[PDB]
Amino acid sequence: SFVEMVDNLRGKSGQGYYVEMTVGSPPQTLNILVDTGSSNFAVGAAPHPFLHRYYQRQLSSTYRDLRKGVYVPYTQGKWEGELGTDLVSIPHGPNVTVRANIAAITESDKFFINGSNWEGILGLAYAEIARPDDSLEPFFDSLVKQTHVPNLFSLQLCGLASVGGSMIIGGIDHSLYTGSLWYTPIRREWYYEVIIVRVEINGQDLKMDCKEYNYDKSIVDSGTTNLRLPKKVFEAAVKSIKAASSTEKFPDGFWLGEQLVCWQAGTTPWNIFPVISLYLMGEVTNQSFRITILPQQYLRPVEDVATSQDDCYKFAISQSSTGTVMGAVIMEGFYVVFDRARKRIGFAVSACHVHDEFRTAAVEGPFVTLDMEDCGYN
Ligand SMILES: C[C@@]1(c2nc(NC(=O)c3ncc(C(F)(F)F)cc3Cl)ccc2F)CO[C@@](C)(C(F)(F)F)C(N)=N1
């Protein structure tokens, strides 16, 4: 039941949200990062200083070796391993056991994070971006094929350092959001690719050709902390946020995410910072809806006992050369429905949210733009 799935996610702020899973027979319990930005189920399978436990294939009678290596290098770090299949279950997910592909990580460099409490990654995106290639069926594809679970999942990421949330597999739990769910089409089934049609900072349009917001794609990624923007959009956004917050001046390093800004505990001047709205393409021509975030979402607290006389924050909007990434900055405080069956992503205000007494994060619409331009970059 969905009620049994509520609060099945845990994590440390900015370290990743994870769900408990079991692999093998007899079952081995592991904490697994929920990642909508990748498509491999990859688990630590050898000792590592940052791993409390790991997958021991020799203890699983149901393990099957696929006799195929896999090497996956990312911008920061890389993982090498071996492919196989085994029985997998989600103790606080659907009441089912399925056979799924598993990449057993045997060597890695700067992939596992100290103190993150996760031992692998559940890539929830599509086969097109699976490694080594699209013939390696992702976990959610196997789950849907082998069971009667509907082809949809939803995430309620709720932003001390400990975080929580819910991953609801096979449905939408109405207790997790308020107001209406607004849907944007999935443009291509690879990443969860979407289209942004307008960006406003404190109600002021950035006034760019909308293709700039999607250069070269825009994705929804629970495996990325920041709201990451293409260079041109990022520079305009920083200029606009600086203009709104000009009563206080911060080091250049802050706007580049290289330095923290600190205030005496409880004194953060939230009202000098603007709201940011991303307008997403609707399901109907030239209609859109907006997602509006507050500074409590894009100025992320950095927990550190040593600086705890203050509240210290990192600016969580950053530049990208690979397109827009709607990471946790966007997802936390919203209930996000990955409706794979209908090729669409829904957004609603979450039951767990940031609102202070002046402003509230929102999901609202509809908005019309009679300008007929397609905002898709490719
Ligand atoms: C597979 C890959 C990947 N992701 C992570 N993620 C995290 O550790 C992480 N996750 C969520 C959050 C929070 F919840 F706070 F947002 C904070 C963190 Cl710090 C770690 C290793 C790794 F290889 C590739 O890199 C990206 C980012 C890719 F570049 F592909 F986008 C991705 N999506 N998945």
Author numbering: -2 to 156, 167 to 385
Give sentences copied directly from the paper behind this entry.
BACE‐1 is a membrane‐bound aspartyl protease required for the processing of the amyloid precursor protein (APP) to form the N‐terminus of Aβ peptides and the protein‐soluble APPβ (sAPPβ) (Vassar et al, 1999). The beta‐site amyloid precursor protein cleaving enzyme‐1 (BACE‐1) initiates the generation of amyloid‐β (Aβ), and the amyloid cascade leading to amyloid plaque deposition, neurodegeneration, and dementia in Alzheimer's disease (AD). Subsequent intramembrane proteolysis catalyzed by the γ‐secretase complex releases amyloid‐β peptides of 38–43 amino acids, which form the pathogenic oligomeric and fibrillary Aβ species. Inhibition of BACE‐1 by low‐molecular‐weight compounds has emerged as a new concept for treatment of AD (Vassar et al, 2014; Eketjall et al, 2016; Kennedy et al, 2016; Timmers et al, 2016, 2017; Yan et al, 2016; Cebers et al, 2017) by preventing the generation and deposition of Aβ rather than just treating the dementia symptoms.
